[PDB]
Design an enzyme around this catalytic site. Structure first.
Site, PDB file in Angstrom:
ATOM      1  N   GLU A  35       0.813  -1.210   0.000  1.00  0.00           N
ATOM      2  CA  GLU A  35       0.000   0.000   0.000  1.00  0.00           C
ATOM      3  C   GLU A  35       0.851   1.266   0.000  1.00  0.00           C
ATOM      4  OE1 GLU A  35      -2.982   0.482  -0.590  1.00  0.00           O
ATOM      5  OE2 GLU A  35      -3.984  -1.463  -0.271  1.00  0.00           O
ATOM      6  N   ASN A  46      -7.357  10.722  -5.150  1.00  0.00           N
ATOM      7  CA  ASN A  46      -8.115  10.090  -6.220  1.00  0.00           C
ATOM      8  C   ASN A  46      -8.969  11.091  -6.995  1.00  0.00           C
ATOM      9  OD1 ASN A  46      -7.315   7.409  -5.411  1.00  0.00           O
ATOM     10  ND2 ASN A  46      -8.597   7.730  -3.636  1.00  0.00           N
ATOM     11  N   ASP A  48     -12.257  10.725  -7.648  1.00  0.00           N
ATOM     12  CA  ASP A  48     -13.616  10.718  -7.132  1.00  0.00           C
ATOM     13  C   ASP A  48     -13.800  11.639  -5.943  1.00  0.00           C
ATOM     14  OD1 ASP A  48     -12.333   9.351  -5.078  1.00  0.00           O
ATOM     15  OD2 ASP A  48     -13.761   7.698  -5.013  1.00  0.00           O
ATOM     16  N   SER A  50     -11.997  11.463  -3.260  1.00  0.00           N
ATOM     17  CA  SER A  50     -11.495  10.823  -2.060  1.00  0.00           C
ATOM     18  C   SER A  50      -9.974  10.737  -2.118  1.00  0.00           C
ATOM     19  CB  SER A  50     -12.087   9.418  -1.900  1.00  0.00           C
ATOM     20  OG  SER A  50     -11.441   8.492  -2.769  1.00  0.00           O
ATOM     21  N   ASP A  52      -6.568   8.406  -0.197  1.00  0.00           N
ATOM     22  CA  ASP A  52      -6.100   7.280   0.606  1.00  0.00           C
ATOM     23  C   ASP A  52      -4.919   7.749   1.450  1.00  0.00           C
ATOM     24  OD1 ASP A  52      -7.819   5.824  -1.197  1.00  0.00           O
ATOM     25  OD2 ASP A  52      -6.177   5.573  -2.531  1.00  0.00           O
ATOM     26  N   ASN A  59      -9.145   4.977   3.013  1.00  0.00           N
ATOM     27  CA  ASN A  59      -9.825   5.918   2.143  1.00  0.00           C
ATOM     28  C   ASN A  59     -10.811   6.821   2.903  1.00  0.00           C
ATOM     29  OD1 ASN A  59     -12.449   6.209   0.055  1.00  0.00           O
ATOM     30  ND2 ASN A  59     -10.448   6.518  -0.897  1.00  0.00           N
TER      31      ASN A  59
END
Length: 129
Positions: A35, A46, A48, A50, A52, A59
């Site tokens: 990760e 991201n 969208d 969002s 991480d 997220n």
């Protein structure tokens, strides 16, 4: 902070992750490796809306609040900044909450893709625990 694998294993064990909900410790270390490459500051933004966050790339839609993400649930009840701490408290507690809310490790795309079905024990081999 960028952890070493054995240092991270020991911290994760002190926070109760070894065999937590059926996931032996190496699963969690493997997930972190792929990760974030063990980097507590890792941040992936991201399209969208969002993001991480942190060593386990948790997220901001379902799990932590960053105030910029549509559909926010904040199920870990934390600011996403807490997931960028050098100490892994918030990230471990939120990882536990993800699983306690009925998600497997399959919630972590890197675990699905780099870790599931492999000899994950190798990630803790030779570590002081």
């Amino acid at each position: 902070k960028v952890f070493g694998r054995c240092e991270l294993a020991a911290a994760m064990k002190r926070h109760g992750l070894d065999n937590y909900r059926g996931y032996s410790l190496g699963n969690w270390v493997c997930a972190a490796k792929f990760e974030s490459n063990f980097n507590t500051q890792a941040t992936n933004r991201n399209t969208d809306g969002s993001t991480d966050y942190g060593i386990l790339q948790i997220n901001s839609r379902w799990w932590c609040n960053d105030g910029r993400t549509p559909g926010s649930r904040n199920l870990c009840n934390i600011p996403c900044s807490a997931l960028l701490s050098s100490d892994i408290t918030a990230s471990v507690n939120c990882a536990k909450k993800i699983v306690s809310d009925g998600n497997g490790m399959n919630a972590w795309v890197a675990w699905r893709n780099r870790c599931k079905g492999t000899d994950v024990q190798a990630w803790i081999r030779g570590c002081r625990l």
